[PDB]
Amino acid sequence: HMFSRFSNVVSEIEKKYVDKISISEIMTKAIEGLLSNLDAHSAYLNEKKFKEFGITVGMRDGVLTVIAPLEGTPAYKAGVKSGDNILKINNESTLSMSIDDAINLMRGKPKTPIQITIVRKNEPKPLVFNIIVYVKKIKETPYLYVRVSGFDKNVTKSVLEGLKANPKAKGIVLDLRGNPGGLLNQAVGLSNLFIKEGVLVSQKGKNKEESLEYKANGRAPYTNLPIAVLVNGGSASASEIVAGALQDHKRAVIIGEKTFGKGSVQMLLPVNKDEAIKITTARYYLPSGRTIQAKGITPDIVIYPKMINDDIQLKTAIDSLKTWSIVDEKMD
Template sequence: MKNKKFITLGFASVTLSLGLLFSSNLFAESSKLVPKESETSRLQSLAKFTKVIGIVEQYNVDDITIEELMDKALDGMMQNLDAHSNYLTKKDYKKLKVQTSGEFGGLGITVGMKDGALTVISPIDGTPADKAGLQSGDIILKIDEKSTISMTIDEAVSLMRGKVGDPIDVTIVRKGEMKPLVIHIVRGIITIESVHVKTINDDTLYIRVASFDQKVAADVAKEIKKRKATTKGIILDLRNNPGGLLDQAVDLVDLFVDKGDIVSQKGRQESDAKTFTASSRATLTKVPMVVLINGGSASASEIVSGALQDHKRAVLVGENTFGKGSVQVVLPITNDEAIKLTIARYYLPSGRTIQAVGVKPDIEVAPGEVKTRKNEFAIKESDLKQHLEEELEKVDGKKDEIKEDKKENKDIITSEMLTKDIQLKEAVDIIKALVIIKG
């Protein structure tokens, strides 16, 4: 039986939710989290800490209270554990609660720490950040006039969140650019449509998953069932998908894999260890698959793509993923304060970790357009079509019919669209080959 739990892949996000698990159960079991050292050693360490606090309080050049000293000590300790753990003061904790439950203006990006720098994991489709031109891999140097050096993820998220309609300037460093770029963005309400479906060549189903919200697996299953009779191959596009709910990642893989492990979670405590397995009852299709990934694919996206790769269920095309495979929980320490702590890491069916490594594609393809050589002497189909339509418009009663024919079908990806996306074009070619082999 599948072992499921409604848990989020802890990511700081400038969207309508942060995707963090709030927990008091772990706090109640805090005695189990301390190192198994001798009581003498622990008392000596605590005495040393108390002594340092006392010395700083007495001799520091600036007058500082014991409360301020403790906040600084806790903040420094948590930040030095890993990039995603931190201490939440009364002010920080209140802001986090607002971000996880309230409606607010944001940019529409997911950020994380990579090599010590605040990095854009991905902009979300159609959001202010996406429209302004922010890209996966951009390093954020400044938020308005504030430097992000030594800034926590939560502090950065708080600065980027604001009133709808208010502008913000984000200074970034981008690979390939000679100098920093200033991106001007106007905050907006972030609404995310997670699943987009189109068809290619009538027999290939293109499924774009922008993020893993509560209905992703159900929406994808619905679309597969609707087109099952005509579908010979599936392209799952997880590019710039920052992640989301773990149970949705597991359920999505389960639609394509009928047995075996999907992902396992391992922490220091036995209670943190969990394994999520596939069930044949949930599997909908075994048609050939290609999964598109890039540096903006993180967390749940990496679990899905990595699991399908380990099961040899899909060919992965694109670029190496972000490398976010750890679990964070928010643990209250008082009514007004808390800590955010990394308690476990995710492992793919083969046993490999995602954290700081990511998932490597089977076929590496950089983004860009398909380069084609023009034949100057060939008659363009578009020119010929336009000429014929002009002739037909001269015929009485046909003008309205021609206009109707010219409407674009938004549910179909055309060959012209494929030339603008070389990664997708490669995926289509691979699907064609796999269908031929299978057939």
């Protein structure tokens, strides 16, 4: 009889444990424990907080870290950076808690100093902080500049208008660095402007049903327009969606540090009034036939660190776009 392990364990732990626990306490402490030990991320949502449902936070190898902070948060002004390994917040250990607790303790009533302690690799001691879409035409360079800090809505038309400003340009710079990512649909729609044939992405799991896929069309006005993409360790999900749609179709050269491979689809479905769960349903797969999750996407060129001259990697990207312009002028 295989239906016996859990009953015996529950009986022993509800009888002889050093403290007294009932059915409810063991059940709630087993469901969430199974959630946390089952996959990378999971969370049980209570009924009271199920009515409605700072820095962006993402686990790496089990230790909670911040992937890519934003300038709009007070923590960036405090001195937070990418790659920071979070260790303790508000005298509470962070080796075991969900992101939800982090977003409640970070976002809420202002004028509340929060004693966040973070361990950085470059220096031993944990620092303590008491914390509280875009298209440009760079000067002295006719070539356009593109900076994206997230794949929000109403961005495809903005990008089209921004690229309409300088059609004569023989190259653009893509700034996907320090990007947590965004919606897969928005990412593939944005990357549609730089490819014409093939599949932009393939979302596949283990069940053939709901294997959502996105295809290219004839609405791309910048297929042959040279591009060089800047990526780094701190780019995730939709960033690698774009950097796989481009690099897999051989329509770009990817320049920067080796990135961090993450991204999967999850959603909320109420199985009961008092039971709510979250689980990794499916993954993103790039057109080459490989997933983002395992190792990330390796740039062809790797190099580590008015305004163009202040970044060596941007200089290498400028090199690459100028070479592409040279090839275009040679053939034309």
